[PDB]
Amino acid sequence: SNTQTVLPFTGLNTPSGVAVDSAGTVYVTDRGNNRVVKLAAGSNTQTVLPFTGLNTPSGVAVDSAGTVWVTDHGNNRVVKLAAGSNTQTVLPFTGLNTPSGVAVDSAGTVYVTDRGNNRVVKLAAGSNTQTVLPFTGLNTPSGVAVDSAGTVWVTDHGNNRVVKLAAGSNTQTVLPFTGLNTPSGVAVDSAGTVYVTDRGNNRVVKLAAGSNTQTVLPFTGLNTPSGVAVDSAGTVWVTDHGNNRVVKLA
Numbered sequence: 343s344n345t346q347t348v349l350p351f352t353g354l355n356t357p358s359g360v361a362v363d364s365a366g367t368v369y370v371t372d373r374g375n376n377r378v379v380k381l382a383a384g385s386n387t388q389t390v391l392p393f394t395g396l397n398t399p400s401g402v403a404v405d406s407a408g409t410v411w412v413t414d415h416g417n418n419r420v421v422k423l424a425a426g427s428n429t430q431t432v433l434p435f436t437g438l439n440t441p442s443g444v445a446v447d448s449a450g451t452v453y454v455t456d457r458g459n460n461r462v463v464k465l466a467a468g469s470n471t472q473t474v475l476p477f478t479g480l481n482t483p484s485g486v487a488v489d490s491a492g493t494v495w496v497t498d499h500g501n502n503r504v505v506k507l508a509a510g511s512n513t514q515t516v517l518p519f520t521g522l523n524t525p526s527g528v529a530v531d532s533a534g535t536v537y538v539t540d541r542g543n544n545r546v547v548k549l550a551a552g553s554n555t556q557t558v559l560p561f562t563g564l565n566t567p568s569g570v571a572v573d574s575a576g577t578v579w580v581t582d583h584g585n586n587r588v589v590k591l592a
Contacts, residue, residue, distance in 0.1 A: 344560040346590065347590050348587050351370065351381060352388060354374075354379075356372075357583060358371045358398075358583060359371040359400055359402040359568075360570065360579050362572075362579055366382075366573065368380065368381045368588070371400060371402045372399075376396045377390050377393070378391040378393055392430075393430055396421075400415040401413040401485075401486075403445050408424075410422060413442060413443065413454060415442060420441060420444060435465065437459065438454070439456060439458030439459045441457060443483075443485045443527075445486045445488045449466075450468075451464055452464065452465045453488055454486070455485065457482050462477055462494065463475070476507065476512055477496060477507060483500075484497050484527070485525070485526055487528045487529050492508075492509030495517075495528050496528070497526055497528045499524055502525065503522060505517065517549055518555065519538060519547060519549065519556050520556060521543070524540070525538045525539065526569070527568055529572045531576065532574065535551045535572075536549045537559075537572060542566075544566065545561065546559040546570060546580055560591065564585070565583070565585045566584035567582055
């Protein structure tokens with residue numbers, strides 16, 4: 343489209359994370375207001391999800407069954423709400439320090455960027471014991487994404503790079519992005535295109551599947567974009583954190 347639309351959220355303050363489910367519902371962590379909000383496709387009226395006591399919520403993910411996971415960055419925990427639940431559940435992660443991003447795969451496995459500990463942790467579906475993924479050399483990692491094949495992508499925020507780890511691998515690959523300044527969010531689509539919010543450069547970039555060099559997306563007037571999500575139609579949603587808004591691009 344090359345023409346962005348602003349989503350009709352109201353009263354956002356420094357929105358951080360964004361996720362989109364199969365029905366086109368958009369979930370946003372309204373980080374400055376300690377709340378998570380959602381907008382149904384073609385809806386005009388946002389709903390506030392019944393989380394309690396959040397402290398700078400920073401990442402959000404949503405599975406096929408509509409369960410919502412949120413990184414409660416200030417409380418060193420990850421919380422979830424099942425589709426029809428009014429009580430949040432704290433996941434049995436241990437030792438988290440300022441957790442930032444979260445992603446969930448088709449099997450229900452949850453991946454979290456444990457930002458203050460420079461590591462990525464996972465809770466396999468049906469398991470109560472976390473494992474630490476074998477990334478190396480991370481510095482204050484923020485965004486995380488997982489594709490259909492179980493490959494995990496991480497924005498290595500402090501090192502201005504984006505890395506990936508194939509499932510069951512001891513091999514970390516640095517992706518060929520260029521000139522990144524504080525990459526903070528990452529998304530991958532079913533074709534394997536990777537989208538990254540380049541926060542310090544006020545732009546969003548992508549490495550199209552099969553390409554050796556990045557493209558800058560035709561967004562307009564971004565200020566410190568923070569999070570990115572993609573749906574099955576290729577629509578890109580970005581939390582334009584410094585402008586207290588959420589933008590999308592078909």
